[PDB]
Amino acid sequence: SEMTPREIVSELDKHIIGQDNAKRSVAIALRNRWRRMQLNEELRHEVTPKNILMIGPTGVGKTEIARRLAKLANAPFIKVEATKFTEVGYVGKEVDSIIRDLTDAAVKMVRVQAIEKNRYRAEELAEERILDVLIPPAKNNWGQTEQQQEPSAARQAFRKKLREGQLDDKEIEIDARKLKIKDAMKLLIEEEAAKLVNPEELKQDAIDAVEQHGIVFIDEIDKICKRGESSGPDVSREGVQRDLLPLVEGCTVSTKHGMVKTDHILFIASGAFQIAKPSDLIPELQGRLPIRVELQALTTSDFERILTEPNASITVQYKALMATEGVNIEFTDSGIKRIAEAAWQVNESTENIGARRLHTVLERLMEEISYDASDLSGQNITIDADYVSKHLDALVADEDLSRFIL
Amino acid sequence: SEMTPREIVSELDKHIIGQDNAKRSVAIALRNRWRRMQLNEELRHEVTPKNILMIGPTGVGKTEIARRLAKLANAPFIKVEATKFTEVGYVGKEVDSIIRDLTDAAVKMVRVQAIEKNRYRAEELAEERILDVLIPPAKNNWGQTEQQQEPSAARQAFRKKLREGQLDDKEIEIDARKLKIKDAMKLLIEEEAAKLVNPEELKQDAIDAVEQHGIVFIDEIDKICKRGESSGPDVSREGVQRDLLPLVEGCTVSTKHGMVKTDHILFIASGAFQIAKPSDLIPELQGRLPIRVELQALTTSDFERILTEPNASITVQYKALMATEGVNIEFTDSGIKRIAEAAWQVNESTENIGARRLHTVLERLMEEISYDASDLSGQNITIDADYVSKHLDALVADEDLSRFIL
Amino acid sequence: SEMTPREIVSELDKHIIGQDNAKRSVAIALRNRWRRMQLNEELRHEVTPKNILMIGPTGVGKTEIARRLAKLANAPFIKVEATKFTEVGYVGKEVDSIIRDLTDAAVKMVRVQAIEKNRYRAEELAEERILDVLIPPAKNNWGQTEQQQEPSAARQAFRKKLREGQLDDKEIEIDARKLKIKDAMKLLIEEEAAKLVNPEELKQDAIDAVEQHGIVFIDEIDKICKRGESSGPDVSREGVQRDLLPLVEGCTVSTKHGMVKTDHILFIASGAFQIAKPSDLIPELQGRLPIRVELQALTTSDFERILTEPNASITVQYKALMATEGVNIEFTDSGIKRIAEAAWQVNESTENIGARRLHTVLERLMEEISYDASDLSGQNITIDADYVSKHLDALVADEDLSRFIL
Amino acid sequence: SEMTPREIVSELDKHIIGQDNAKRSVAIALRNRWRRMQLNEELRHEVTPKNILMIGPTGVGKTEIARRLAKLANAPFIKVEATKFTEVGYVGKEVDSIIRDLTDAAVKMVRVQAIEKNRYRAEELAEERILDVLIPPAKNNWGQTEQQQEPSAARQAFRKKLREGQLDDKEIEIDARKLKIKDAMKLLIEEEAAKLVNPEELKQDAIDAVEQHGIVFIDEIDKICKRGESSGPDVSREGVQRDLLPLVEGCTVSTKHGMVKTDHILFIASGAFQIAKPSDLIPELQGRLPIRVELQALTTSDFERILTEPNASITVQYKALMATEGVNIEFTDSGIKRIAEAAWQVNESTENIGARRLHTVLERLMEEISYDASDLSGQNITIDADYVSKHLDALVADEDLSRFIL
Ligand SMILES: Nc1ncnc2c1ncn2[C@@H]1O[C@H](COP(=O)(O)OP(=O)(O)OP(=O)(O)O)[C@@H](O)[C@H]1O
Ligand SMILES: Nc1ncnc2c1ncn2[C@@H]1O[C@H](COP(=O)(O)OP(=O)(O)OP(=O)(O)O)[C@@H](O)[C@H]1O
Ligand SMILES: [Mg+2]
Incomplete structure (x- = not known):
């Protein structure tokens, strides 16, 4: 009683834009669940989860794809930052918390x-x-x-x-x-x-949901790799890897809900790896992260589709919010395409997040309508290509200013 | 349940290619537990466990040998990173945890x-x-x-x-x-x-379980020796060696399930010892690690063997999963050869991570198939050397890529 | 249950070769508790105990004597490692623990x-x-x-x-x-x-086992002395001596099993004192370690005795374990002398670790027999000078191997 | 209803040897108690305790004089080490504890x-x-x-x-x-x-006893003075002075017994000040430690008296202990005088503690009787001058050995 590789990508295709490869990967992983629980008893133990390691820049969909995936299988999910456990320099946060949190998530x-x-x-x-x-x-x-x-x-x-x-x-x-x-x-x-x-x-x-369906998203696992120093002192991070294996290669951990195995939980780590390469992960981790997938950096179309398609895109939302004041906003194809080229620009020019950039740009372009909404009652404002450019051009053009207000 | 050394090595042989010296080492140990029982009271409580110290490179079998050794012995086992307690000014856990964990494992x-x-x-x-x-x-x-x-x-x-x-x-x-x-x-x-x-x-x-058959496996023990880049943090790594002493010399630790005595737990400390030497350990520890054995690097032939000969070999495991999708996979002997060869190459041209490499290569190789699968029910797909080259030669060739994907 | 010094030294002599002076000191400490036990109310609690401080090289018998003395005394014993409490940048558990552990140990x-x-x-x-x-x-x-x-x-x-x-x-x-x-x-x-x-x-x-029979052994009491390198850390070591005082002075600590009075716990401080000297301990503590005794380094002859004279000597141990497989091991005098010489030689050419070297040496020497044993059933194997040579001589010489195998 | 400066010194003269100056000083402070509580209401607030700062070497009576004094007035007492609160480098112990402890002391x-x-x-x-x-x-x-x-x-x-x-x-x-x-x-x-x-x-x-009669003995307050560095970084200690002020110049503090003032508690800090001088204490403390008294180093006679006079001198104690075995020990004037000269010697020669040195010397000199006591039943051994010199001479003479066994 389970979907399939392709059938899965379809579902993910209903929420994520692009990143087909990554999809195919989370697809397989999720399917191997239904594959193992379908084998003799002697194997069920031998075969371990095919952990995936995602490689990409921010704002391109990584984490969403995992949310959507765990969602797609109403599986306990949790997202952690590798570096959260790096505060070992003087503070203290321990990995057990991960599974600990996971269960909670499951009980909810x-x-x-x-x-x-x-x-x-x-x-x-x-x-x-x-x-x-x-x-x-x-x-x-x-x-x-x-x-x-x-x-x-x-x-x-x-x-x-x-x-x-x-x-x-x-x-x-x-x-x-x-x-x-x-x-x-x-x-x-x-x-x-x-x-x-x-x-x-x-x-x-x-405990069953967790142990049999849980998914963990370990973010920026690249912030905890080798680094220029020595494989002994700068272990303040390498040692953070040495602390995840137990979780990754099956261990245990007590929670205020009982005991949890972790022997076969789906882990999806991710990083940009624009400094360190997956190869710098300690051998145990390399071993346990068999599926490697690289995500691509978004494109204006993606942006254009991310602005519209989503059942609750910032576009629909804004229109909604201003309807609260009696104003009728309407984003036109050229307008959207324009906000799209605006984000891409800024990402390109200055630093480059990704879809993230859509928030400030859109909220910036709508500043005046946002401020005047009350008085615009009963009117029908339409954001076309014209509008956008004579509101965002000056700014996008101005790289310096872009680093502050966009 | 008490079998002879030669026999114990025969089981071990079923899940681990090579590393005979290591196998004999561990078998001798396991075997003495039975010899000690045949002894009178005096000697029975004079004869302590012959803790092993394995020396070898990554992905060669040190740990696999300890698990399989605990399994055929049906004893509570436990892996522990030596470094889990290290710190030049951090926090960490307490070494006794090793016995708490081992004990939980006994109850389970x-x-x-x-x-x-x-x-x-x-x-x-x-x-x-x-x-x-x-x-x-x-x-x-x-x-x-x-x-x-x-x-x-x-x-x-x-x-x-x-x-x-x-x-x-x-x-x-x-x-x-x-x-x-x-x-x-x-x-x-x-x-x-x-x-x-x-x-x-x-x-x-x-309890008897733990006290009479416990097997603890301390990995990366060599990450605790001398060093030289300091005095405190190093004699602080040593600290970890001191803290472990009670366990290996015999002591009592309190656990949820009661009081546990460590006097008869068998210890298998592991290490690559590329930087430090077993002689760099603190004397008391060297005293408690009587048996020393060096495991050797694996060879391409070894990889081919590792690929199919062990029991639930990754190959047999792949085949199993695929069968769930109604697909019949078969590996050409040369197919098996090209794979071992690909792995070796990468381990050689990037980071050598041992038999671990085989997993990543095997996954990539069979991804297009893995994703299709369902849409191939009733088909007999054969992985010949041509299939293995068409899917890995270029990859293996791109040293950057291999650092990211294989 | 109370015997004379001379008698305790007799028991002590069944397991520890040499170190007569130390056997005496310890003998006195013990008989002394019985003596205090013979006093009136007035003094029973106004009699300041006589803790020992053992000075000697590694592997000469300091710990052994305390253990065995704790055995004939039949007293809960515990062995603390002075440094565990230091931390120029850590937390270093608090000394309360020593009485805690001892109690958990008593309970067992x-x-x-x-x-x-x-x-x-x-x-x-x-x-x-x-x-x-x-x-x-x-x-x-x-x-x-x-x-x-x-x-x-x-x-x-x-x-x-x-x-x-x-x-x-x-x-x-x-x-x-x-x-x-x-x-x-x-x-x-x-x-x-x-x-x-x-x-x-x-x-x-x-509590009555502890408070009135408890023996504690503090090791590395010399890794706590001044030193000199710096000043902050020194007072951080000295901190341990200060904090250590109440236990040796005579106080009450609280455990999970009630209140315990450290007043009649016999303390056996111990150190190599190669860099530091008793005179460098904090005055308070020196005066609180009235009984001082040194242990001499061992010599080859000593090794030969350690090898055979003691009650359940490792020699009688191996011979026993092998007869368990139906193998008759006979150690020739020539064979012992070579084992002892081999150990001594390795201790000379690498790190000197005292009598501990005999273990590693004996084990190695006996591995092959130890593995084959089962099939050599009924036969006689004599470990003589010739036998010892074939198996060790090459290793002892190769100083790099000895730092790994012996 | 209170003793007087002179009458007090006598009481102290009944337990302490020499150190009349310091006595006259603790005497005065104790008397000012009875002087303040005897004045108008406007003054009782204005007049604060005349804190005493003792300056001298170890083993000369400092702390004893404080115990004896707090005892002499059955006043809550407590002895702390200034350095205890210096573990602030990474650990954590707070001065509130002092008063906190003081109250407990009082409730007991x-x-x-x-x-x-x-x-x-x-x-x-x-x-x-x-x-x-x-x-x-x-x-x-x-x-x-x-x-x-x-x-x-x-x-x-x-x-x-x-x-x-x-x-x-x-x-x-x-x-x-x-x-x-x-x-x-x-x-x-x-x-x-x-x-x-x-x-x-x-x-x-x-809270009343504490707040009105409490006495705090702050030990080695010289260990927390200036030091060669800078009045900013090495404050790891000067800051410890900045933390006692509150206590010394009156503040408060909550305890599991209610609230305690501290406004006028008698503090008696001490130090050897052989490195730093009281002048190096921060100005606030100097101001609050008005009474300055220097104690002198002990003399053989002091040692001689310390050996005999005390109602429970080590001498009497030993004679007692051995009587437990039937032996009748007797220290003769010449004998004691000899033990005194022996302690003085070692103190002089090597490092100089003080009365402290009496423990090991006496216990060393009695080693044989102590060990043989059992067989000496019914006999009358007399430690005269002869005995001592032909037991302690060779050792005292041997400076090097002295630093270990004496
Ligand atoms: N003969 C073999 N040699 C090496 N690995 C093998 C062999 N047979 C199977 N394997 C598999 O290869 C992987 C190697 O992991 P293993 O922990 O045994 O290596 P290791 O070098 O001992 O590890 P560590 O350095 O952490 O002690 C395991 O997943 C194991 O199941
Ligand atoms: N007479 C003996 N002298 C020395 N070692 C002996 C003797 N008899 C047996 N041994 C063995 O030699 C080893 C030395 O351990 P022991 O703890 O006595 O040495 P140590 O120098 O006191 O140790 P540490 O430095 O840890 O306090 C032990 O395994 C012990 O059982
Ligand atoms: Mg290793």
């Missing part, structure tokens, strides 16, 4: 997993107990087949009003106190929800 | 031993309780010799239905809560398995 | 002490309760002097059968259930075993 | 102080509750002037029997259980002593 996974499952039932019972105070039921009933006319037009009346209308004052009993529907409603929900939920029967779900 | 094993031993007894009584809800048994019974017709076609009915067919709804009491068979089953099993397991028995058992 | 002895002490009592009562089910005793009895004919030939019959024979099916009552002697026996043992064990006592019994 | 003062104070009261309330079970009192009573005939001959009967007689079986109620007077007595006493032990009525006793 499984938790929320039950809630949203029967949240309706709760709300139902919740509003099924608010009608009792509105129309004090006369003890004893039932007996015939009038289940349809049983709730009485009374309860049915307040029913419609409650879920769809006024009603915002009364007192409900718990353990009897005055309150208010809009809140007493959110008071019962949690209570009711309790009844449905279970306890120690969360272990073989969370 | 024991739990398993007992569960699978009487898993039936559990599942049995488990469903034996799911039938009671399905068919409320009328209090009081027995009396005659009708044991067959006693479970009444009623229970017998559900029983087949339950075990075989359909799993799916009701409410069973614990501490009365609606559930679902397919799940209430797993719930009851654990609940039932419990009653069977004797805590003190497994706690004591888990 | 006590536990396994009590058990193996009155085990017979349990197994006896255990089976004494299995005969009750075999031959249901008729209530009320006794009265005359028919004590040996009272158990009746019935109980006496099953008695012999039980401990020496069949009988493997029966149901016993605990808290009434069918079982099986083979296991119902063990089941009872632990149950009864409980009865005898006093948890409110042994905890105390532990 | 007041504690054993309270018990023996109202010990009678407890026992009374104890047996007063044991008669209730013996003669179950009839509820309701009193009313007339029959206080003498009220206890009834019944309670009065058991009263005498109890404290002076049999009665050793009964059950008392606590939290109702059978016991035995002989024990049921000691059980009630403590349990009763609890009610008395001023629960919260311990505050205005400890």
